[PDB]
Amino acid sequence: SGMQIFVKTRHSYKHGLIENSTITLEVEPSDTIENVKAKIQDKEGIPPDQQVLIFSRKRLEDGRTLSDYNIQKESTLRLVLVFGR
């Protein structure tokens, strides 16, 4: 799939107890942040409207690509789980 990046999480979504874990995603440099969140929903079940992703202390806006943030192979994003609406 081109690249593999890492997302470290700290949330309680699986069973109800907060916990740390790093997950691996297969990505393209062209992939949009929406697509990255959709791939997080596939393995984690968290809806995209409840995900916020951060790279190097910068909040990643949806309609942009990973190359726009220069998110390369084996880069690490941060997943913060937030409230619905």
Partner: protein, 45 residues
């Protein structure tokens, strides 16, 4: 307080760790969600 969100679940299950066996047995009667969170094999050991 009675919603079935991940926020309500993280809070009350964090709270249920500080409840004794007596206060847990009275929380199971509040609502259907509390009954389910109070009946997990981690609060009774």
């Amino acid at each position: 307080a009675g919603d079935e969100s991940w926020m309500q679940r993280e809070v009350w299950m964090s709270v249920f760790r500080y409840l004794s066996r007596r206060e847990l047995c009275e929380c199971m009667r509040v609502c259907k969600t509390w009954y389910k969170w109070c009946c997990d094999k981690r609060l009774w050991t």
